Design a protein around this ligand. Structure first.
Ligand SMILES: *[C@@H]1O[C@H](CO)[C@@H](O)[C@H](O)[C@H]1NC(C)=O
Ligand SMILES: [Ca+2]
Ligand SMILES: [Ca+2]
Ligand SMILES: [Ca+2]
Length: 522
């Protein structure tokens, strides 16, 4: 477990060294300035001052000796036997380390132990931590809260959750938190059935991985040049969301896009098309999710076979079947045979858990050689200041720490990059053939490929560069923009060939807009 600590240490000491340079300050002044930017929420600002108190004196002497973060953290025993992040010949590596020895020479608390043990299960099971009625929908934003699924309007009632069939069409209280309830004043007719009946409502559900949940570390947290108090305001919400931003993803996103592009999420297209689908979105996605381990949390899916509407399900395991952290990485890659066996088991679980009239769309896997081609000679946020860390050096560093999320594509071995894409193609064809030659009772099966090159063409006509489609910090996942151009590219395709999956526009939208408006928001 030295990798995660070693990485974290090098990240922090890097920020420290760089904040000192940006402001022409001392190492002490930088550490005080760093904590100054962090918020108090979740005790982050307290932990900062503690670490400065515990390690500050040692860090100041080492950085004053021109040592870089990687050497510092190996001297401070945060990195254990070496992995270079900055260029340095091994002879120069030994001297600096031997010079650091002559200079220098959590949840266990009984009162905090159990809540730690309680938080662990809620996340690991992919269920909201704040959920009194245990309907898996929450009134809280993060901790698997309503950022991932529609917010719960009645947290006390375990029969009230988005996607539920109208219970007597909500004469007295909103049954599915979709913002429509009550009766028509003129005629005494329930608002719900008046508006939403016969429209064939359908929900959007995501079975995906980190990319599906829009994993995103803001580069602002790592670029000292533009750091401020406003850089870390969203840090507490991010940590409690597992560094995921599903509210902004391309599938289950419901917030306005910061990126500025006009494309909207599938859920937004879904809700826009039929105001009854309001809040009928679910993000059943976890970091590291693959065809092998989806079963370990697919139970978090909340959809009752009898009391809920149909659903549009997207199976989006877009890499972890080829992307792994092992040194001998190819053996860990899922084979087409294992891919077939794992998906069929996953589909079988859905036919037993999804109401009839549902639809499942299998995503293909993209050609991840795009990662190295676009980024290998560009500078990681931690290297942008002094232009001393390229994504190539960043991939090698992570590889050394056994932390590289995709040894197959985030690699300088072209032969392996090709080998990894070939496997990604073979797995995509398996998903294609399944949708064609496999039939199920409660839903039909379709396949749309990723086709990253198509999204790049759409991006280049817009005046953008391909490297602007990848998360800057990890250089691996697609960013908010790429996710939306994909969701758009997917939505258009299903429309042109399988419009019944999405349905057809409900003409009461305007009549629902006229009467209810925002419908309680999200
Ligand atoms: C590149 O990857 C291939 C496939 O795993 C392997 O056979 C080859 O030895 C690798 N080359 C180097 C220089 O590691
Ligand atoms: Ca609830
Ligand atoms: Ca409820
Ligand atoms: Ca309702």
């Amino acid at each position: 477990s030295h990798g995660q600590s070693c990485l974290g240490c090098v990240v922090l000491v890097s920020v420290i060294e760089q904040l000192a340079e940006v402001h022409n300050s001392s190492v002490q002044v930088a550490m005080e300035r760093l904590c100054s930017y962090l918020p108090e929420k979740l005790f982050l600002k307290t932990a900062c001052y503690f670490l400065v108190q515990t390690f500050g004196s040692d860090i100041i002497k080492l950085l004053d000796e021109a040592m870089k973060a990687d050497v510092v953290c190996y001297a401070l025993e945060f990195c254990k036997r070496q992995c270079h992040l900055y260029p340095l010949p091994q002879e120069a590596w030994e001297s600096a380390l031997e010079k650091a020895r002559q200079v220098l020479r959590i949840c266990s608390l009984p009162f905090l132990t159990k809540i730690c043990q309680k938080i662990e299960l809620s996340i690991k099971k992919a269920v909201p931590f704040k959920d009194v009625d245990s309907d898996k929908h929450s009134v809280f934003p993060t901790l698997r809260g309503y950022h991932w699924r529609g917010r719960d309007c009645n947290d006390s009632d375990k029969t009230v959750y988005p996607g539920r069939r109208p219970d007597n069409w909500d004469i007295h209280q909103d049954s599915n938190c979709n913002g429509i309830w009550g009766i028509d004043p003129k005629d005494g007719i329930p608002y719900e059935k008046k508006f939403c009946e016969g429209s064939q409502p359908r929900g959007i559900i995501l079975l995906g991985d980190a990319a599906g949940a829009h994993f995103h570390i803001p580069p602002e947290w790592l670029t000292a040049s533009q750091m401020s108090v406003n850089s870390f305001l969203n840090l507490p919400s991010a940590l409690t969301d597992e560094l995921n931003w599903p509210q902004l993803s391309g599938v289950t996103g419901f917030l306005d896009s910061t990126s500025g592009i006009e494309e909207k999420s599938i859920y937004h297209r879904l809700r826009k098309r039929n105001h009854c689908n309001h809040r009928d979105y679910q993000s059943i996605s976890k970091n590291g999710a693959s065809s092998r381990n989806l079963k370990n949390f697919i139970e978090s899916l909340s959809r009752n076979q009898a009391s809920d509407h149909p659903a549009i399900v997207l199976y989006a395991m877009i890499g972890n079947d080829v992307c792994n952290s092992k040194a001998d990485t190819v053996p860990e890659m899922t084979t087409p045979e294992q891919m077939y066996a794992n998906v069929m088991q996953t589909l079988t679980h859905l036919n037993s858990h999804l109401p009839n009239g549902s639809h499942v769309i299998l995503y293909g896997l993209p050609d991840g050689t795009f990662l190295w081609d676009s980024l290998h000679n560009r500078y990681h946020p931690l290297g942008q200041l002094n232009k001393d860390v390229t994504y190539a050096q960043f991939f090698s560093f992570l590889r050394c720490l056994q932390l590289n999320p995709c040894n197959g594509w985030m690699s300088s071995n072209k032969t392996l990059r090709t080998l990894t894409s070939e496997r990604a193609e073979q797995l995509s064809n398996t998903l294609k053939k399944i949708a064609t030659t496999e039939t199920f009772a409660n839903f039909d099966l379709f396949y749309v490929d990723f086709a990253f090159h198509e999204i790049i063409e759409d991006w280049q006509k817009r005046g953008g560069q391909p490297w602007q489609l990848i998360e800057p910090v990890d250089g691996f996942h697609p960013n908010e923009v790429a996710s939306l151009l994909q969701a758009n590219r997917v939505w258009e395709k299903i429309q042109l060939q399988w419009p019944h999956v999405l349905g057809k526009e409900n003409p009461f939208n305007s009549q629902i807009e006229e009467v209810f408006g925002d419908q309680g928001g999200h």
